[PDB]
């Protein structure tokens, strides 16, 4: 809820839109990325939980 506290005016809505973008790129298909990692279990757990 911290990203929506001030209220959905015009500047907060569009900043949400470009916040989907960087999250759609990195944190999607997250299991497939987790086979090529140093850390491993603390990526899926930081994704799931």
């Amino acid at each position: 809820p911290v990203y929506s506290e001030r209220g959905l005016k015009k500047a907060v809505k569009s900043d949400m839109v470009s916040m989907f973008k960087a999250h759609l790129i990195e944190h999607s298909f997250f299991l497939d990325k987790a086979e090529l990692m140093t850390r491993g279990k603390q990526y899926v757990l930081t994704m799931l939980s």
Partner: protein, 48 residues
């Protein structure tokens, strides 16, 4: 306003523009008691 800039923005689309569609007879309640006019109603008197 117009749906935004308000306390509790999730209950925006539920409370505002759904109840306008539905509330044509105000029937979301639980009927419990009736006031039958007299001992015998005969379906003619106004039942409360």
């Amino acid at each position: 306003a117009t749906l935004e800039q308000r306390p509790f923005p999730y209950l925006a689309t539920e409370a505002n523009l759904l109840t306008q569609i539905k509330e044509s007879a105000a029937d979301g309640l639980f009927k419990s008691f009736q006031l039958l006019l007299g001992k015998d109603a005969r379906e003619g008197s106004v039942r409360f």
